[PDB]
Homo-oligomer: A and B are copies of this chain.
Amino acid sequence: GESWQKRYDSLQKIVEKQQQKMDQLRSQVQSLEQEVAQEEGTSQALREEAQRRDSALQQLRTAVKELSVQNQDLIEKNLTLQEHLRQA
């Protein structure tokens, strides 16, 4: 059979392969933490832009209503002028 010294030499190869795998996993953890942080910045930026555009939506809807009031005003004035024209 193999001597214990030979088995030790083979086991040290396993120890070194474990360390290399652990190095790769530690690097992957760091990269993933960075990806999470970057994606959180993206999501927060999207939420802030959504707030600004929701405010723009609000302002446009009210603008439509304001222009509808002006429309009614001008229509009523036009009818008043039309009635004056029936006495001209």
Contact = CB atoms under 8 A, between A and B. Distances in A.
Interface residues of A, number: 50
A82 to B, nearest CB: 6
A53 B43 contact: no
Interface string A63-82: 11001101100110110011
Contacts of A32: 29, 32-33, 35-36
Interface string A1-43: 0011101100110110011011001101100110110011011
Contact of A53 (B25, B42, B53): B53
Contacts of A53: 50, 53-54, 57
A12 to B, nearest CB: 6
